[PDB]
Design a protein around this ligand. Structure first.
Ligand SMILES: CC(C)CCC[C@@H](C)[C@H]1CC[C@H]2[C@@H]3CC=C4C[C@@H](O)CC[C@]4(C)[C@H]3CC[C@]12C
Ligand SMILES: CC(C)CCC[C@@H](C)[C@H]1CC[C@H]2[C@@H]3CC=C4C[C@@H](O)CC[C@]4(C)[C@H]3CC[C@]12C
Ligand SMILES: OC[C@H]1O[C@H](O[C@H]2[C@H](O)[C@@H](O)[C@@H](O)O[C@@H]2CO)[C@H](O)[C@@H](O)[C@@H]1O
Ligand SMILES: COC(=O)[C@H]1[C@@H](c2ccc(I)cc2)C[C@@H]2CC[C@H]1N2C
Ligand SMILES: [Cl-]
Ligand code: NA
Ligand code: NA
Lengths: 534, 219, 213
């Protein structure tokens, strides 16, 4: 008494499945398989997934659902001292919402430019091109491919920007796509999860439709089999390699959505006795299975290119947006009925980003809705007052220097910020709140306590897991750079400012809570660490 | 291995209160949740209350809700049940069980402790030796008996020759009538087993502290 | 409250013969949330079947379980004397937790006439003015038997305490203890006390008379 609940729980599943499955699934996982020991990468991947990844994902879903409240109130309910974690987690998603919807806008901007039987990115003869242009991907950074130039020169107009200090004029063709996205988001998140959980039926399930079409499309392509070899052909030498276990650990962590408070928010709308743990691993499996399936969708087209298009495999296979907005479309244009694959592909990218942003924004709304009764009864005015903030600042990503702004938040906005956030999540839950109390909570929900396995991972494996990633993250750290452009020392300082801005709340809200509570130290401590009961 | 020992319970006047305890051993108590399941004299199983591992989640049946308080000690591995304003309908043998995994039910139960809520005063049984009729002719194996009548409350320990001969021994269950129990026990020995040897009915009624032996010739 | 009713309440089966007992719920219950318990006579209930298909530790494979929704059934492949008990189902689907009516399983055996033994009031009884005659009916099948108390030639009804022993694990028979309680003042009033047992085994009631002589 009293909270809105998911309609069918397939709403919740598809909502969480949708949130968990995004562009990273397509442009990252496959690259890591190609990069590390082929299919042998699955070994460290699975291991890191079992001990590190799922236990954290399981945690948030079980945590949010039980406490039955938004991210902030959830940690305010759990460990009021660490309630800053709820604050930190929510504004982490608040930050991401700025640069993230840009990729969907890109997807739509490509979706708009994709109506024709002549695709613009297959040509080096166009107005925006360069004498250095290639028909397809090349080794030399100086010479961009044809599809690469289209993305950089036309859509982004990134060449107009000398760096981050120069954003350049706004591209209003881009801002339209951005707003078109927010309109989709607003009307999806308008009435709350009631409408949200219903919308995810498309956004979450559409990609799988497209993935099948493209998977069938790719595997039929000449040399398609060759791509899978570059994909799944195992080198177990990588298994011994430390960097591979890091990529596995990192990917499994960032592939699942913990730390954004979305899972906390989403699962909280669940029925109290609704099985989470079943949903936890079901959602997790579908997520990883999706990437695995998508992996074939990607490298099937790559083997085609290396065969039919005469392109070096290492040149075409790439992570990040470069794969989706350049490499892949480049092969589609060569394919018969290109416009079809293009249209559905870019629609897939949008649908892959849409249900994700739903969760992210939902985490802010839900967290605030439970914390503040005003905006709770005020909603749909809030998402406007929110998304309006986004789009206004979103114009910064619609500029000619757009990607430069994007890439900055991408490496910062959800940073180590989420690592230390989730680390304090795991530590606050496993030690501060205790595993004895947590397993006790789930038993009262799903009917049975979490296995000895799960408790161990939360207490030990997870913390070192995040630590294993956070340490190896700082060990390979380099000042932010894209292409030949290196970000200035002030630009990096702002990125860290964004990273700290979240996590700083944890200690800050800790001191704020400590200063607000009377009594001696040990007294002031326990009172702040005493859970919402009663 | 796992042992659940349940203690307390006894006679309690209606409206009164009584505390029950279950001594758990052979498993980590703080890990497993516990539940009190009671069974009426009519053999009716009713879940009373459940307490979680940490004991921060408590469930009561609509019957005993608010009257009963189920406590827990994880340090001493002891599950209590705090009863208040007891009712005649609350008369039953309470069980201590776990109780942790809902999908697996209750895997281990205690021996059980008996609770009797009645206004009837405790009375000691009058043990009556039963000697066969003097009529001819005696059969191959003659039956002897012992009558325990007008005693309250249960239980009563009735054995034969200090529990030596169990062969052909039927000890009938008590039957409550007008707030008093009447019990009887039959034993069949050989024609010459009695009264050649010593056949005596020993009765134990701990409630009134009545310990009685009956050895009788066919006088 | 989810009400779990079982049936039959009292079931008779000879060793080796297959038996099926059912548990039907007023409300639907998750197939994983329903469990069965076996309580032997004078023994604490023990977990028998959990999650409706799953035998417990030490439970013979002869046992089985099935059903779903509001209908579940416990079945024994070939019944044995060891299996004689009262079986209770259970639902954890939601609180309050509830147990089934229970199914008492009793082994069937060959019909055996009761051994009827009448006993007079003890010498130590009439002291308080009490007189109570006891009539033992031992080792007989089937369970139900009706004693008839007759003082002189006329039957007496009021003041009869019947007690029934549960089926023993040895010969699988029953026993009944009838106690006719009177007053010593009224005891001397009638000379001859007779209790008779009307049973299935014989159309002729088993009669036991007596007198002080
Ligand atoms: C590998 C890709 C293609 C599919 C995803 C595989 C994942 C879901 C598999 C691989 C190893 C599996 C884990 C192995 C160990 C256990 C122990 C068990 O007590 C809980 C489930 C859990 C934690 C499994 C969850 C599912 C799991 C993590
Ligand atoms: C490339 C091809 C094989 C991909 C196709 C995979 C599709 C069919 C899979 C992936 C994720 C799956 C969904 C994941 C969530 C659920 C939960 C369940 O309560 C209803 C089914 C439903 C909605 C699944 C339906 C089938 C599903 C959509
Ligand atoms: O939102 C669509 C966006 O792009 C349009 O460009 C199309 C059009 O066919 C030509 O302009 C040419 O550039 O091909 C493009 C498709 O690849 C519009 O040019 C632009 O104004 C509009 O905003
Ligand atoms: C960093 O932003 C994201 O991509 C995260 C998430 C996300 C969180 C907030 C927002 I606003 C958008 C996406 C989408 C998926 C699920 C976790 C992670 N992606 C794998
Ligand atoms: Cl992934
Ligand atoms: Na992912
Ligand atoms: Na998504």
């Amino acid at each position: 008494d009293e909270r809105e609940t998911w309609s069918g729980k397939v709403d919740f599943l598809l909502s969480v499945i949708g949130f968990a499955v995004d562009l990273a699934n397509v442009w990252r996982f496959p690259y890591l398989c190609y990069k590390n020991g082929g299919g042998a990468f699955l070994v460290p991947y699975g291991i890191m997934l079992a001990v590190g990844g799922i236990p954290l994902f399981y945690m948030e879903l079980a945590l949010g659902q039980h406490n039955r409240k938004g991210a902030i109130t959830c940690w305010g309910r759990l460990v009021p001292l660490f309630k800053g974690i709820g604050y930190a987690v929510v504004l982490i998603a608040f930050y991401v919402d700025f640069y993230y919807n840009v990729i969907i806008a890109w997807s739509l901007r490509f979706f708009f430019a994709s109506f024709t039987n002549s695709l613009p990115w297959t040509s080096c003869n166009n107005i925006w091109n360069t004498p250095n242009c290639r028909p397809f991907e090349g080794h030399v950074e100086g010479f961009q491919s044809a599809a690469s130039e289209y993305f950089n020169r036309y859509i982004l107009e990134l060449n107009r920007s000398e760096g981050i200090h120069d954003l350049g004029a706004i591209k209003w063709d881009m801002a339209l796509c951005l707003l078109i996205v927010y309109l989709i988001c607003y009307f999806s998140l308008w009435k709350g999860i009631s409408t949200s959980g219903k919308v995810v039926w498309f956004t979450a399930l559409f990609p799988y439709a497209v993935l099948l079409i493209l998977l069938i499309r790719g595997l039929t392509l000449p040399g398609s089999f060759l791509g899978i070899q570059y994909y799944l052909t195992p080198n177990f030498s990588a298994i011994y390699k430390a960097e591979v276990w890091v990529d596995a650990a990192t990917q499994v962590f960032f592939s699942l959505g913990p730390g954004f408070g979305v899972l906390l928010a989403y699962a909280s709308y669940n029925k109290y006795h609704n099985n989470v743990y079943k949903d936890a691993l079901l959602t997790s499996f579908i997520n990883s299975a999706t990437s695995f399936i998508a992996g074939f969708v990607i490298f099937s087209v790559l083997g085609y290119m290396a065969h039919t298009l005469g392109v070096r495999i290492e040149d075409v296979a790439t992570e990040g947006p470069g794969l989706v907005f350049v490499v892949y479309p480049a092969a589609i244009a060569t394919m018969p009925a290109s416009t079809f694959w293009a249209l559905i592909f870019f629609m897939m990218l949008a649908t892959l980003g849409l249900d994700s942003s739903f969760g992210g924004s939902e985490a802010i709304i839900t967290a605030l809705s439970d914390e503040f009764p005003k905006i709770k009864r005020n909603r749909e005015l809030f998402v406007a007052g929110l998304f309006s903030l986004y789009f206004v600042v979103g114009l910064a990503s619609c500029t000619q220097g757009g990607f430069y702004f994007f890439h900055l938040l991408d490496r910062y906005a959800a940073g180590y910020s989420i690592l230390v956030a989730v680390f304090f999540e795991a530590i606050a839950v496993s030690w501060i709140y205790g595993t004895n109390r947590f397993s006790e909570d789930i038993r009262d929900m799903i009917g049975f306590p979490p296995g000895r396995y799960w408790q161990v991972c939360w207490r030990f494996v997870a913390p070192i897991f995040l630590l294993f990633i956070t340490v190896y993250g700082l060990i390979g750290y380099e000042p932010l750079t894209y292409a030949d452009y290196v970000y200035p020392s002030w630009a990096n300082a702002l990125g860290w400012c964004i990273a700290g801005s979240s996590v700083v709340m944890i200690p800050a809200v800790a001191i704020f809570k400590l200063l607000s509570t009377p009594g001696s130290l040990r007294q002031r401590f326990t009172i702040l660490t005493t859970p919402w009961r009663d | 291995e796992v042992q659940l020992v349940e203690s307390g319970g006894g006679l309690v006047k209606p409206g009164g209160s009584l505390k029950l305890s279950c001594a758990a051993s052979g498993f980590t108590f703080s890990s497993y949740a516990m539940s009190w399941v009671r069974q009426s004299p009519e053999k009716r199983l009713e879940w009373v209350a459940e307490i979680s591992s940490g004991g921060r989640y408590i469930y009561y049946s609509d019957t005993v809700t608010g009257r009963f308080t189920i406590s827990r000690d994880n340090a001493r591995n002891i599950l209590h049940l705090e009863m208040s304003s007891l009712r005649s309908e609350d008369t039953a043998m309470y069980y201590c069980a776990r109780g942790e995994v809902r999908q697996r039910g209750f895997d281990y139960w205690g021996q059980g402790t008996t609770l009797t809520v009645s206004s009837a005063k405790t009375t000691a049984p009058s043990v009556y030796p039963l000697a066969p009729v003097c009529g001819d002719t005696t059969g191959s194996s003659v039956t002897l008996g012992c009558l325990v009548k007008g005693y309250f409350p249960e239980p009563v320990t009735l054995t034969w020759n200090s529990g030596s001969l169990s062969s052909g021994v039927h000890t009938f269950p008590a039957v409550l009538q007008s707030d008093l129990y009447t019990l009887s026990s039959s034993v069949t020995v050989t024609s010459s087993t009695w009264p050649s040897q010593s056949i005596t009915c020993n009765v134990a009624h701990p409630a009134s502290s009545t310990k009685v032996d009956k050895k009788i010739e066919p006088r | 409250e989810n009400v779990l009713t079982q049936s039959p309440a009292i079931m008779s089966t000879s060793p080796g013969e297959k038996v099926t007992m059912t548990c039907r719920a007023s409300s639907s219950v998750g197939s994983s949330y329903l469990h069965w318990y076996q309580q032997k006579s004078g023994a604490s209930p023990k977990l028998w079947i959990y999650s409706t298909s799953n035998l417990a530790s030490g439970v013979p494979a002869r046992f089985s379980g099935s059903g779903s929704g509001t209908s579940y059934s416990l079945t024994i492949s070939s019944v044995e004397a060891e299996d004689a008990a009262t079986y209770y189902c259970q639902q954890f689907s939601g609180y309050p937790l509830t147990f089934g009516s229970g199914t008492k399983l009793e082994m069937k055996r060959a019909d055996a006439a009761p051994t009827v033994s009448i006993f007079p009031p003890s010498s130590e009884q009439l002291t308080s003015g009490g007189a109570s005659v006891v009539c033992f009916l031992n080792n007989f099948y089937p369970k139900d038997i009706n004693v008839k108390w007759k003082i002189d030639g006329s039957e007496r009804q009021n003041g009869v305490l019947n007690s029934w022993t549960d089926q023993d694990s040895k010969d699988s028979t029953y026993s009944m203890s009838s106690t006719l309680t009177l007053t010593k003042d009224e005891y001397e009033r009638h000379n001859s006390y007779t209790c008779e047992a009307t049973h299935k085994t014989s159309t002729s009631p088993i009669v036991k008379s007596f007198n002080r002589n």
